[PDB]
Design a protein around this ligand. Structure first.
Ligand code: HEM
Ligand code: HEM
Ligand SMILES: Cc1cc(N)nc2cc(-c3ccc(CCN)cc3)ccc12
Ligand SMILES: Cc1cc(N)nc2cc(-c3ccc(CCN)cc3)ccc12
Ligand SMILES: Cc1cc(N)nc2cc(-c3ccc(CCN)cc3)ccc12
Ligand SMILES: Cc1cc(N)nc2cc(-c3ccc(CCN)cc3)ccc12
Ligand SMILES: [Gd]
Ligand SMILES: [Gd]
Ligand SMILES: [Gd]
Ligand SMILES: [Zn+2]
Ligand SMILES: [Zn+2]
Ligand SMILES: [Zn+2]
Lengths: 401, 402
């Protein structure tokens, strides 16, 4: 069992949950690959049993009659058909556990309070669009954001998948310009391309919300426009730099990831969009400051009259902090839920304490838990962490094209 | 077959083939990663020595030559007759530069080939040790134009005690425990401060008292050696536009000189081999002055800047840390003492990764330690994937001598 020290407090724990790591990560005793972004019917039965036992243990009913009857039901269904279906309560338990097991998520103190929408009876792309609109409506909640997930029908062999082609439900278009540069979000050139080849009329703003490319089984992707009143947006302004508003920046309220595969008890749900609320550094540092994103850092530093000729005036650092101040101020002014990285990491430290009692550990990816600015000023920087893969899980998947 | 490593800011892809030489086993396994942990006979020696000899002769393009064969024979024979062998001076120089070049946590490795190696293997007493150390400090400091250096004292050998430097750095500030439970000075040094006091040092009572050296000669109790004040170059800390900052009374020293690691070369161990470079500014501003178990000035600076400290969403911590770092870089440049900011240091590390891919087919690097402690994603190493593994020659930790 690995020893795990918090060097701030001096406190020691042992991670016994890691003993139950499902599959294999990328590291070996010869070399560590922890910074890498992307590393049978018998097999399905074995995972279904594991998961059913997990569910029945978590409610303190292991060995009960209902437990035995559920296992027998799954054995019979897998024998007859090669698969099985989850009861709604097992689906709820599974989607929560997948969030709880997500090593790169700093927001897991919230894992128990997730709303799960059962969309497994969904039949068409049009019907899928209705579920996604209900989800966005519920999750946004006029700016009082609420974590949620909508689970579309499971994969089954010999049948096409439901897929959401967009990587997130709300994204800004990125139009390639005459000279090889992008107008809008450059992280989205390929998805913007696909939208136009499928009949979308593009715009030319920096903040044009993309349509949804939805794919029902074996049917090609169908274009769906999101009603503007449904996408809540926040104009970015700064509390003391009056000119910041004039940059015309803005961002959307709802981070809604739509390209991951949910895996529960050997079943796979390729369309299972989920959402929560933002940590400010995601917007301020990643989306507005990364050189491959909106890359505004130089423009802000000019407006602040900073000496941008030498790296040692720390103009990049000054400009980055004020952008993050503007994000927090604008979301709070607009009454849209947001959390700063100091509050987020403090709550994640509490989540680690809770998880040690409940399960004897917590899988955590240190490079993604530590915020991308002011790392060592947060309590997670000096916290040793163990990374391993538990099931249920969210997983990356190949693109649908 | 070989790990593929991507830079997500440029899109470039390399394959790390040097990891196949990995001469040790780290803490990770296929089932869990522990890459964030801080602290994870004759033919054993002969095999490590032969691999080191092979490296040296490959480096000067002379593999398989007669000198390469003859040197292998000599080392085999020496180990057989005596249990150990002696490095030639040129191999020791190569060995010490390789140990720096192989340190996965070091961001300043672009400079690895310009290490100045001082050979103190003929040292015989603690007084002779102190003389070599004072020369090291004077050479490395160079009146503010800092220069990389390592002094290597005699290797560990059976039948004789080790040379050791009890201090973890040649230059450290005392930490005095106060009756109210708090610490005056550097809290990370309360233990070595107590030891210096037991071995006869008359303490001061300031916040930046430089500690004496505790030097141990083979099979002797350690002896105390005061550093002449003109030897230890110090920088008063001030801020270019916040005039009250000088009133905080803060200073730091010019020279980071690590003195408690063990240098390992071809199966030989040098338990006393202090080395020094120059600071990256986040080491002083963020780690030494802001960490809660160190001088812990963040909130007092934030109050003095008139920041709202009751809520975290003002980001007062981040604003105060940036200004502390500004003051560090400004102060060292004013005093004409070498210092590098984390933006310049990480850009040159990116250059080093390119150089090493051409030279050796890879570079071992601990992402968590290479990415600076503030403004991580604003530097080019944040989006650069990295492979961590142990190569030899190498610096390594060793137990404290008491
Ligand atoms: C409620 C507030 C939430 C916050 C503040 C939050 C925060 C974050 C952050 C900051 C990241 C990493 C960002 C990055 O480095 O790019 C992340 C990743 C992640 N989050 Fe959370 N999250 C929240 C809710 C959720 C929910 C509801 C789920 C799923 C049910 C979830 C699952 C994940 C997963 C799977 C990842 C990793 C994605 C990947 O590896 O690509 N999070 N989250
Ligand atoms: C020349 C300028 C140098 C710079 C700017 C520099 C910078 C750094 C930094 C920032 C760290 C990490 C410290 C931390 O995160 O707390 C480090 C670690 C380290 N440096 Fe370098 N360094 C330099 C020279 C050297 C030299 C000359 C050597 C040896 C010959 C060396 C060997 C190491 C080692 C072994 C570590 C890691 C210690 C450990 O594993 O804990 N460095 N250095
Ligand atoms: C649910 C949720 C909430 C939130 N505040 N941030 C997220 C951030 C992500 C995310 C995950 C990965 C990436 C980079 C691509 N691997 C970018 C963003 C996923 C989900 C999030
Ligand atoms: C090493 C590391 C740490 C971290 N917290 N986030 C990263 C995020 C990226 C990253 C950068 C860009 C993209 C866009 C492509 N999905 C996805 C991921 C790469 C490396 C990261
Ligand atoms: C030679 C050199 C130069 C420099 N600028 N920083 C160093 C920093 C270290 C260092 C190594 C480890 C630690 C924490 C203890 N693991 C703190 C500092 C060692 C050598 C350094
Ligand atoms: C995870 C991680 C990354 C990093 N760059 N530095 C750390 C530094 C520490 C650390 C903090 C304080 C001390 C002082 C006790 N020797 C030693 C180590 C702990 C964890 C770290
Ligand atoms: Gd069924
Ligand atoms: Gd102006
Ligand atoms: Gd002033
Ligand atoms: Zn690892
Ligand atoms: Zn980024
Ligand atoms: Zn620290």
């Amino acid at each position: 069992f690995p020893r795990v020290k918090n060097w701030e407090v001096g406190s020691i724990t042992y991670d016994t949950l890691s003993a139950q790591a499902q599959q294999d990560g990328p590291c070996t005793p010869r070399r560590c690959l922890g910074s890498l972004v992307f590393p049978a019917p018998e097999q399905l039965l074995s995972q279904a049993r594991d998961f059913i036992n997990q569910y029945y243990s978590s409610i303190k009913r292991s060995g009960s009659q209902a437990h035995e009857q559920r296992l027998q039901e799954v054995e019979a269904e897998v024998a007859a058909t090669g698969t099985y279906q989850l009861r709604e309560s097992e689906l709820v338990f599974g989607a929560k556990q997948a969030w709880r097991n997500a090593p790169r998520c700093v927001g897991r103190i919230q894992w128990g309070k997730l709303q799960v929408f059962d969309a497994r009876d969904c039949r068409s792309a049009q019907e899928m669009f209705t579920y996604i609109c209900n989800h966005i409506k519920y999750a946004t909640n006029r700016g009082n954001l609420r974590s949620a997930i909508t689970v579309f029908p499971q994969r089954c062999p010999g049948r096409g998948d439901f897929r959401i082609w967009n990587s997130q439900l709300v994204r800004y278009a990125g139009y390639r310009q005459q000279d090889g540069s992008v107008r809008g979000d450059p992280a989205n050139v390929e998805i913007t391309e696909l939208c136009i080849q499928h009949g979308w009329t593009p715009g030319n703003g920096r903040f044009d919300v993309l349509p949804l490319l939805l794919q029902a089984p074996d049917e090609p992707p169908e274009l769906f426009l999101l009603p503007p009143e449904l996408v809540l947006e926040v104009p970015l302004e700064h509390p003391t730099l009056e000119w910041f508003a004039a940059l015309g920046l803005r961002w959307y309220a709802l981070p809604a990831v739509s390209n991951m595969l949910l895996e529960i008890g050997g079943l796979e749900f390729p369309a299972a969009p989920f959402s929560g609320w933002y940590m400010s550094t995601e917007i301020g540092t990643r989306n507005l400051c990364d050189p491959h994103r909106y890359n505004i850092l130089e423009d802000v530093a000019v407006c602040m009259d900073l000496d941008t000729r030498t790296t040692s005036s720390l103009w990049k650092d000054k400009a980055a902090v004020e952008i993050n101040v503007a994000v927090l101020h604008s979301y709070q002014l607009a009454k849209v839920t947001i959390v700063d990285h100091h509050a987020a990491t403090a709550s994640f430290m509490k989540h680690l304490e809770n998880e040690q009692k409940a399960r004897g550990g917590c899988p955590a990816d240190w490079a993604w838990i530590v915020p991308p600015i002011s790392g060592s000023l947060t309590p997670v920087f000096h916290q040793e962490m163990v990374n391993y893969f538990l099931s249920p899980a969210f997983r990356y998947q190949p693109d649908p094209w």
